Design a protein around this ligand. Sequence first.
Ligand SMILES: OC[C@H]1O[C@H](O[C@H]2[C@H](O)[C@@H](O)[C@H](O)O[C@@H]2CO)[C@H](O)[C@@H](O)[C@@H]1O
Length: 368
Amino acid sequence: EGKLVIWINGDKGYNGLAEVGKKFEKDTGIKVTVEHPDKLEEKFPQVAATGDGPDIIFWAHDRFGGYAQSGLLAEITPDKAFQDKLYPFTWDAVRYNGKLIAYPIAVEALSLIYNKDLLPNPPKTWEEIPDPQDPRVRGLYKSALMFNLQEPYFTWPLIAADGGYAFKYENGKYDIKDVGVDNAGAKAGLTFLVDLIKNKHMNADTDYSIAEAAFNKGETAMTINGPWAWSNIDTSKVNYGVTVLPTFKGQPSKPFVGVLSAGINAASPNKELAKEFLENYLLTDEGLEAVNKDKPLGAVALKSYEEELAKDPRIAATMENAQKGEIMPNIPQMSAFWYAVRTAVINAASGRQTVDEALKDAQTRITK
Ligand SMILES: OC[C@H]1O[C@H](O[C@H]2[C@H](O)[C@@H](O)[C@H](O)O[C@@H]2CO)[C@H](O)[C@@H](O)[C@@H]1O
């Protein structure tokens, strides 16, 4: 009691938060502890399931419906005046069973970050990446594209591009049995990713870390990452641009828009202290700008603050791609989807399964 323990993934600005935390204490004389586990997404459900853990917790809203259905998260109640400070859509994202289960922090979406000093003009097509059709670049391709291949969230826009989909959205409801993970669209997208690899263009063991170091050092021209990545690049002295993602089979790459939400542990007896921290401190200009400077938020859910930095060009592009992708469901079976697809991508890329056997397997694990 009298001490907030907040969790926030490692790629987010945990140091920005902690600082805001100090601002709390310098006023309320309360200790806020910004920890940031590894796999906090999966630990949380397990630690709070036993009345233990973090007071407050951060994660892209797709994981909240689950926490909710199990009841590890307190129903939040800000007044309608506060609610209006935030764009409507973001509140919709933290809505489960007609009950707000989190505070919206910011909207994020992947983009194509390219090295302006190697590629003054980044491709407009995935199909150009392996075969560029321009002798000016051939002498350049260094690796052309490197991004994390371990998390399915990175491969999704490609798979989605020509028609893949998680759970079918039927105006207000998602038919949780109409899974579009194994179908031409998904097959076509994954097959391409496999060629990129089997055609020496990409390496199956690329994870966030490798791709980041690589693009940052300058040993690859292009990468795909969220707003959080921009920070290290700025302190890597790399000349980069953030643009719309390449189109696959003519259609655009549809990212999966995620809303960084900060919930409250039901098992926590510090709820009135969370509300004030999140409401009067973080969810403000000065507060969000604090977290933000550590590592960029994307389009912050706070209106006033979203507009000021709305003029930032990468925020503009982050919104362009977000605009083409679909915002992700917060239903409980999302977690089943990610685990099922991660595995699917891995075996596909790794060579352990055919594109079809791999995808039909994931599908089935989801519909089972
Ligand atoms: O890849 C599946 C996971 O993707 C999303 O997670 C993203 C997360 O939203 C993003 O902000 C983060 O920074 O990268 C991860 C994946 O590396 C979903 O939020 C996760 O819960 C999924 O499991």
